[PDB]
Ligand binder design. Structure first.
Ligand SMILES: *[C@@H]1O[C@H](CO)[C@@H](O[C@@H]2O[C@H](CO)[C@@H](O[C@@H]3O[C@H](CO)[C@@H](O)[C@H](O)[C@@H]3O)[C@H](O)[C@H]2NC(C)=O)[C@H](O)[C@H]1NC(C)=O
Ligand SMILES: *[C@@H]1O[C@H](CO)[C@@H](O[C@@H]2O[C@H](CO)[C@@H](O)[C@H](O)[C@H]2NC(C)=O)[C@H](O)[C@H]1NC(C)=O
Ligand SMILES: *[C@@H]1O[C@H](CO)[C@@H](O[C@@H]2O[C@H](CO)[C@@H](O)[C@H](O)[C@H]2NC(C)=O)[C@H](O)[C@H]1NC(C)=O
Ligand SMILES: *[C@@H]1O[C@H](CO)[C@@H](O[C@@H]2O[C@H](CO)[C@@H](O)[C@H](O)[C@H]2NC(C)=O)[C@H](O)[C@H]1NC(C)=O
Ligand SMILES: *[C@@H]1O[C@H](CO)[C@@H](O)[C@H](O)[C@H]1NC(C)=O
Ligand SMILES: *[C@@H]1O[C@H](CO)[C@@H](O)[C@H](O)[C@H]1NC(C)=O
Lengths: 215, 211, 221
């Protein structure tokens, strides 16, 4: 059970720069190390196989190195839409098996920008259906990693929320996220203070948006 | 040509032999090779030489024939003084490139010793994991030794050129070939020497693994 | 020149079994291993093991032991994967990969042949139309939106004010809920001094059910 740990998780760069990704291994590795990229909605692409050999079609920008337990992928003159997720990969052992990295995200480098937080109470039409949904918006922030927590009358909610993130906007290079909280019509009317508390690198302190029931 | 290697292997025993065929760090013994006997434990016979476990050097093999690809796993190495790989064919001798899939496909290992002919003997491994060897025919020279190699001590006229039947060049040396540690895993500790054979006047420069 | 053809995208009731297919071009596999790698929506590439068709040797990864089974014939074109007792976590895309392997002699590791992927969605559900709910504005700029909730399957397409308002619009990727249905939010940020006067409507279009809904989002009272 070789475990390829890949770092960084996210690399924040701009075109023209050199992107270096590392992959360390719980054990030694018999060459046949591979690097893959994946663009959203598309299947993984082979970049380097056998630690350093460039696949067919891969531009000379991509260089491989490593041996033993430590391997790095070297991307020179970062061009547009070399920006994607990257996986390191090893083949071998008996019975023959695949081990993959956890992944690395190249995003377009930006200034830190905090989220704009808006909270939406459940529709009166939705309440007529027997379900309440509460929505929390984080509108245009950077970097991608923002944490959201739902507190209903000061009770942290686990297993009631679900969230989505957009892809980095072509023009502002920022991200957006909306988290959706679900409650029964009765359980929603069993409480008063519905809160959305956001954590982000642009925020020296938690930002909490909230509303009172019916008010 | 890699396609011509017979490849019918089940390893229901979990012997471990299947992994060793493919990955170098999965190589397979000191308990079981204690049946092999040194050449000194046998007795001299000087009567005129007539012709008669597989990993013991003193194995007396039957002469090589044609064997079905059905029962073969891994490559088949036949030995002139030097190593050579024999692939799958049909019963008429024409090469078959189907990984041994056909029940008809066979390996033609029939041997007539060089210099006259082809090879001294061959080794392969069957499907259950057992090394199997043919060659010769070996030489008939409680401790009788039917010579498969260069038994100069027990009969002067029994030399590898005269009595050879397989990879064993002397009772203590076997030819080194890429899959030697697969067919004879217990020869792992052997030291390797650059050696040279003269059989029919052709120089056979090869490497040899010895004790 | 080897190509792989995988099974079609399936949808299975949670707690059933699903069999996905992997067929190769060049007659049968040989000396090659046919490995399986999954990827849940958005997550990483998560290997599952494989089978080596010539020998029958099965490889199971630790994350899926006991519910997955790999089958193939010694000289068939097709290798199989069956996954039993599906939950919504299993909703993912499954790849098969044909490769040659070895470290040692005649047999060295060659080949990276991937299938096209097989989407498997795990829901109790059948084609259902969305429920469009307003996210009314309340508090510079204000935010408002539409909550497209409880529809199956993807895709829906949201646009605003018949397409004249696109600037500042975010439609977030949808999420598979515990019901097996999908839920989506499109929002747009607009000038705060416009709310009572500029009318805002979102256009939800769910092709699989021929459901078209136009819900007016007006600030709450
Ligand atoms: C690979 O070679 C081995 C031998 O090295 C084959 O195994 C042998 O198979 C035969 C019959 O298939 C066994 O015969 C049995 O002998 C016992 C004697 O105790 C007898 O009581 C039974 O009625 C039967 O005749 C033999 O024991 C067995 N030897 C061993 C120990 O393996 C093996 O079948 C070969 N694999 C192939 C050809 O796929
Ligand atoms: C495996 O067998 C096939 C025939 O069964 C061999 O076939 C040719 O290989 C060359 C390699 O460059 C190809 O260009 C041809 O198109 C192949 N087919 C034909 C028309 O014969 C193949 O070489 C064998 N592979 C090995 C290395 O053993
Ligand atoms: C595999 O074995 C079969 C045995 O039936 C071979 O069959 C022959 O096929 C040719 C096709 O041109 C016929 O003309 C022969 O009459 C068949 N012979 C027999 C014994 O029926 C087949 O050729 C074999 N394939 C390989 C890989 O050698
Ligand atoms: C081959 O040589 C190795 C040492 O290089 C032998 O390994 C040792 O064998 C003794 C037996 O008396 C054991 O007590 C030790 O534990 C072994 N050490 C290691 C490193 O495993 C080995 O037995 C020799 N023979 C074969 C055929 O394996
Ligand atoms: C391997 O050998 C065993 C024991 O004879 C047999 O039962 C098994 O079916 C063989 N496996 C295959 C797939 O050939
Ligand atoms: C080779 O040996 C076989 C037995 O394995 C025998 O039938 C055949 O005639 C011999 N000669 C040939 C054709 O190679």
């Amino acid at each position: 059970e070789i475990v390829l740990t890949q770092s960084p998780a996210s690399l924040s760069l701009s075109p023209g720069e050199r992107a270096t990704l590392s992959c360390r291994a719980s054990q030694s590795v018999d060459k046949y190390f591979a690097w893959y990229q994946q663009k959203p909605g598309q299947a993984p692409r082979l970049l380097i196989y056998e630690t350093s050999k460039r696949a067919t079609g891969i531009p000379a920008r991509f260089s491989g190195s490593g041996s033993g337990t430590d391997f790095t992928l070297t991307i020179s003159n970062l061009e547009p839409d070399d920006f994607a997720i990257y996986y390191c990969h090893h083949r071998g052992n008996w019975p023959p098996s695949f081990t993959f990295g956890q992944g690395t995200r190249l995003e377009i480098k930006r200034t830190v920008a905090a989220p704009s937080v808006f909270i939406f109470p459940p529709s009166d039409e939705q309440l007529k259906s027997g379900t309440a949904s509460v929505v929390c918006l984080l509108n245009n922030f950077y970097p991608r990693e923002a944490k959201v927590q739902w507190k209903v009358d000061n009770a942290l909610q686990s297993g009631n929320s679900q969230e989505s993130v957009t892809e980095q906007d072509s023009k502002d290079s920022t991200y957006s996220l909306s988290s959706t909280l679900t409650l029964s019509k009765a359980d929603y009317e069993k409480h008063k203070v519905y809160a959305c508390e956001v954590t982000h690198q642009g925020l020296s302190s938690p930002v909490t948006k909230s509303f009172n029931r019916g008010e | 040509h890699i396609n011509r290697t017979a490849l019918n292997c089940n390893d229901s025993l979990h012997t471990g032999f299947l992994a060793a065929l493919f990955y170098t760090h999965k190589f397979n013994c000191p308990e079981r090779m204690a049946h092999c006997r040194p050449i000194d434990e046998f007795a001299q016979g000087w009567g005129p030489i007539t012709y008669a476990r597989p990993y013991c050097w003193h194995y007396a093999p039957r002469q090589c024939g044609t064997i079905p690809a059905s029962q073969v796993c891994g490559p088949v190495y036949c030995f002139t003084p030097s190593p050579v790989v024999v692939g799958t064919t049909d019963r008429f001798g024409a090469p078959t490139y189907t990984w041994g899939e056909n029940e008809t496909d066979v390996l033609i290992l029939n041997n007539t010793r060089p210099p006259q002919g082809n090879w001294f003997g061959c080794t392969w491994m069957n499907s259950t994991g057992f090394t199997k060897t043919c060659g010769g025919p070996p030489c008939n020279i409680n401790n009788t030794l039917t010579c498969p190699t260069d038994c100069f001590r027990k009969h002067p006229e029994a030399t590898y050129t005269k009595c050879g039947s397989g990879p064993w060049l002397t009772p203590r040396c076997l030819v080194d070939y890429p899959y030697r540690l697969w067919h004879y895993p217990c020869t792992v500790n052997f030291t390797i020497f650059k050696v040279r054979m003269y059989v029919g006047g052709v120089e056979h420069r090869l490497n040899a693994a010895c004790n | 020149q080897v190509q792989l053809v995988q099974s079609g995208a399936e949808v299975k009731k949670p707690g059933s079994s699903v069999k996905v297919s992997c067929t190769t071009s060049g007659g049968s596999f040989g000396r090659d291993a046919v490995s399986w790698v999954r990827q849940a929506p958005g997550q990483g590439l998560e290997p599952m093991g494989g089978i080596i068709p010539i020998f029958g040797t099965s490889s199971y990864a630790q994350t899926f032991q006991g519910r997955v089974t790999f089958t193939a014939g010694k000289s068939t074109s097709t290798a199989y994967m069956e996954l039993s007792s599906l939950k919504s976590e299993d909703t993912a895309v499954y790849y098969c990969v044909r490769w040659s392997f070895g470290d040692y002699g005649l047999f060295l590791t060659e080949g990276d042949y991937w299938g096209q992927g097989t989407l498997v969605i795990v829901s109790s559900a059948s084609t259902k139309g969305p429920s469009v709910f307003p996210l009314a504005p309340s508090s510079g700029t204000a935010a408002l939106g539409c909550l497209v909730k409880d529809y199956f399957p993807e895709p829906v397409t949201v646009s605003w004010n018949s397409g004249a308002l696109t600037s500042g619009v975010h439609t977030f990727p949808a999420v598979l809920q515990s019901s097996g249905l999908y839920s989506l939010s499109s929002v747009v940020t607009v000038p705060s001094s416009s709310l009572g006067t500029q009318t805002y409507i979102c256009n939800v279009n769910h092709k699989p059910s021929n459901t078209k809904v136009d819900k007016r989002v007006e600030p709450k009272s």
